[PDB]
């Protein structure tokens, strides 16, 4: 009848898994608490924004980030789980890049943060590979026909970040000012950095 | 495995539930949600009980309707629990006793996996490759939309990793291979029924062959 299977509440199941393992001595003291703090406080799109602002103001770093992203990220100390082999992909006046994991949720965790619910959604996983212009449009980002959209599907160990184009109106801004307009969605590729009116 | 998780290209879904820069809320929306990844890392890095690839495959092995109705982080609770049972670390009885009710798991694997292929080719940037026209019932990191399709190499990784189709089953013969960023024209993958430009898939060497 296609009905869902009987299940205890998910919180009860998840804590049962914790307690089963913890009660056997298999989970070190503070271990899941430590990971929770890493996930919440260290893995962050503020890191990828820092990298973008550096690339925008430092042509030598830009070239390194685009040719050896792992080495560039390592200079900042931001390599980590789900972020060991990094490739940055450059937007240009004729090219917009967008990242997905159609098979699950793969994301450059240390520099983008853990993926948000929408990126893990079946809607994004099914649709952005086939109709990225319509998906971006519905999300609030218009990409003109004069621009190729290129979708990177994160199917192996490469972990990607988008280097968006730097918008007009930001000439001479400091790295801190530039970082503020590079959002998580700009690093994933579904948004373009916005400059205040 | 040609499972329902292989979603790219499926038609009929609605809007993505986000508009750009909208509030996504906290990292975790419930107090248990950090547990699946934390306990996955305990399994991989502290216990040595399974690989990350085995976690992807056990989630693929959820019964298909169960997969489709389960939120993301819950799929990983189910997947990590399943691997703990399969590896002999936990029993389903104790999980259900602690949970106070049913805790259905992913289904058993129907494939033993396959080894890293013995014959492969080192490709160079600019070369034309075809994705091998092969069907793999166990784990594979090839989305079906690119099976049999031709594209061009844009990158060869400078590192190598175990072949997913072996390490995702806990086999001893995963070897190591580099992967390749293969750029496909949108029309190669979806004919006229696409609005995009190109799609780049990051494909293990053992999924590829010279085009022609
Ligand atoms: Fe993923
Ligand atoms: Mg399929
Ligand atoms: Mg029973
Ligand atoms: Mg021969």
DSSP for residue A52 = H
Q: Does A87 touch chain B (CB under 8 A)?
A: yes
Last residue of a domain, one of B110, B129, B153: B110
CA B199 to centroid of ligand 2, rounded, Å: 18
Q: Are residues B83 and B44 in the same domain?
A: yes
Q: Rounded CA gap, A182 and A164, in Å?
A: 8
| β-bridge partners, B210 | B129
Residues B85 and B122 in one domain: no
Beta strand ranges found along chain B (DSSP E): 128-131, 150-156, 179-185, 198-204, 208-210
- Expressed in angstroms and rounded, the spacing between residue B120 Cα and the centre of ligand 4 is 11
Q: Are residues B146 and B210 in the same domain?
A: yes
- In this structure, the answer to whether residues B103 and B117 fall within a common structural domain is no
Which of B2, B8, B28, B203 would you mutate first to test chain A, the one with the most A CBs within 10 A? B8
Please give the structure tokens belonging to residue B176. 């190591």
Q: Hunting for tokens 């801004």 — which residue is that?
A: A173
Asked whether residue B145 falls in the same domain as residue B122, the answer is yes
Q: Do B10 and B97 share a domain, yes or no?
A: yes
Among B110, B126, B156, where does a domain finish?
A: B110
For chain B, how many structural domains are there in total? 2
The three-point CA angle A116-A117-A119 to 5° equals 70
What are the φ and ψ backbone dihedral angles of B147, each rounded to 5 degrees? -60, 130
For the domain that residue A25 is a member of, what is the CATH number?
Answer: 3.90.330.10
- Is A113:B27 a contact under the CB 8 Å cutoff? yes
What CA–CA distance (Å, rounded) separates A92 from B19?
Answer: 23
Cα–Cα dist A81/A188, whole Å: 18
**Same domain for B66 and B139:** no
Domain match, B181 and B129 both: yes
Two structure tokens written together for A42: 């260290």
Which of B57, B82, B110 is where one domain is finished? B110
Residues B105 and B67 placed together within one structural domain of the fold:
yes
Residues from chain B contacting residue A44 (CB–CB below 8 Å): none
Q: Tell me which H or E stretch contains A73.
A: helix A69-76
Enclosing domain of residue A171:
1-197
- Which residue segment(s) compose the domain that B55 sits in? 1-110
- For A54, residues 6+ apart whose C-beta sits below 8 A from its C-beta are A61, A65, A175
Q: Which of residues 166-195 of B touch A (CB under 8 A)?
A: 179, 181, 183, 186, 189-190, 193-195
Of A2, A6, A185, the CB nearest to B65: A2
CATH code of B83's domain: 1.10.472.20
Phi, psi of B155 (to 5 degrees): -160, 140
CA distance A156 to B157: 11
CB B87 within 8 A of CB B58: no
User: Phi first, then psi: what are they for B82, rounded to 5°?
Assistant: -60, -45
Residues B104, B44 share a domain: yes
Q: Under an 8 A CB cutoff, do A131 and B30 touch?
A: no
What is the number of residues in chain A? Answer: 197
Mutate to test the interface with A, among B12, B66, B164, B199 (most CBs of A within 10 A): B199
Flag if B195 and A132 touch (Cβ within 8 Å). Answer: yes
Active-site residue list of B = 56, 72, 76
* 3-class state of residue B48 by DSSP: coil
Q: Do B42 and A27 touch (CB under 8 A)?
A: yes
Asked if B78 and B134 sit in the same domain, the reply is: no
Q: Collapsing DSSP states into helix, strand and coil, what is residue B183?
A: strand
Residue position matching structure tokens 């106070």? B100
Helix (H) or strand (E) holding A97: strand A95-100
Residue A193 near residue A143 (C-beta atoms within 8 A): no
CATH number at residue B117: 2.30.30.50
Integer Cα distance of B40 and B43 in angstroms: 5
Count up the domains in chain A and report the number: 1
Q: Which residue, among B110, B54, B45, B101, has the nearest Cα to B82 in the 3D structure?
A: B54
Map residue B134 onto helix, strand or coil: coil
As given in the structure block, the two tokens for residue B139 are: 């784990």
**H or E stretch covering A111:** helix A109-112
Kindly state whether residues B9 and B88 are assigned to the same domain.
Answer: yes
- In order of A117, B1, B61, the CA distances from B116 in angstroms are 34, 16, 21
Q: Report the run of H or E that residue B199 belongs to, with start and end.
A: strand B198-204
Query: With an 8 Å Cβ cutoff, are A130 and B69 in contact?
Result: no
Q: Which residues of B touch A154 (CB under 8 A)?
A: 202
Helix (H, G, I), strand (E, B), or coil: what is residue A56? helix
What's the full length of chain B, in residues? Answer: 212
**Distance separating alpha carbons of residues B12 and B144, to the nearest angstrom:** 18
Tokens of A150: 């290129």
3-state percent helix, strand, coil for chain B, nearest multiple of 5: 30, 15, 55
Chain A hits for B69, CB-CB cut-off 8 Å, are 4
Which of residues 77 through 96 in chain B touch A, CB cutoff 8 A?
77-78, 80-81, 84, 89-90, 94-96
User: B8–A105: do the CB atoms touch at under 8 Å?
Assistant: no
Method of determination is: X-ray
């Amino acid at each position: 009848e296609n009905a869902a299977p009987a299940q205890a509440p998910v919180s009860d199941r998840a804590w049962a898994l914790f307690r089963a393992l913890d009660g056997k001595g298999l989970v070190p003291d503070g271990y899941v608490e430590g990971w929770k703090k890493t996930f919440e406080e260290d893995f962050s799109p503020r890191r990828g924004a820092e990298l973008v602002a550096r690339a925008w103001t430092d042509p030598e770093f830009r070239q390194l980030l685009l040719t050896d992203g792992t080495a560039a990220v390592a200079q900042y100390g931001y390599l980590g789980p789900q972020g060991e082999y990094i490739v940055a992909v450059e937007d240009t006046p004729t090219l917009k890049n967008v990242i997905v994991c159609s098979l699950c949720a793969c994301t450059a965790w240390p520099i983008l943060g853990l993926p948000p619910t929408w990126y893990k959604s079946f809607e994004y996983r099914a649709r952005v590979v086939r109709e990225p212009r319509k998906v971006l449009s519905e999300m609030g980002t218009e990409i003109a026909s004069d621009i190729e959209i290129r979708v990177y599907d994160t199917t192996a160990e490469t972990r990607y970040m988008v280097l968006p184009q730097r918008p007009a109106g930001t000439e001479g801004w400091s790295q801190e000012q530039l970082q503020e307009i590079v959002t998580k969605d700009c690093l994933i590729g579904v948004a373009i950095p916005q400059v205040p009116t | 495995m040609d499972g329902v998780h292989d979603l790219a290209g499926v038609q009929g879904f609605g809007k993505v539930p986000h508009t750009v820069n909208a509030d996504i809320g906290p990292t975790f929306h419930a107090e248990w949600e950090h547990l699946p990844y934390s306990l996955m890392f305990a399994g991989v890095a502290e216990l040595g009980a399974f690989s990350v690839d085995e976690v992807r495959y056990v989630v693929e092995r959820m019964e298909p309707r169960h997969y489709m109705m389960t939120p993301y982080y819950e799929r990983y609770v189910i997947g990590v629990a399943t691997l703990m049972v399969e590896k002999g670390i936990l029993t389903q009885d104790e999980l259900e006793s602690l949970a106070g009710g049913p805790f259905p798991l992913s289904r058993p694997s129907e494939s033993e996996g396959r080894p890293a292929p013995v014959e492969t080719t080192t490709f160079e940037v600019g070369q034309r490759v075809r994705v091998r026209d092969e069907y793999v019932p166990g784990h594979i990191r090839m989305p079906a939309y690119c099976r049999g399709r031709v594209g061009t190499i844009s990158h060869r990784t400078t590192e190598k990793w175990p072949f997913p189709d072996a390490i995702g089953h806990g086999r001893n013969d995963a070897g190591e291979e580099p992967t390749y960023h293969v750029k496909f024209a949108a029309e190669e993958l979806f004919g006229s029924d696409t609005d995009g430009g190109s799609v780049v898939v990051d494909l293990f060497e053992g999924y590829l062959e010279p085009a022609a």
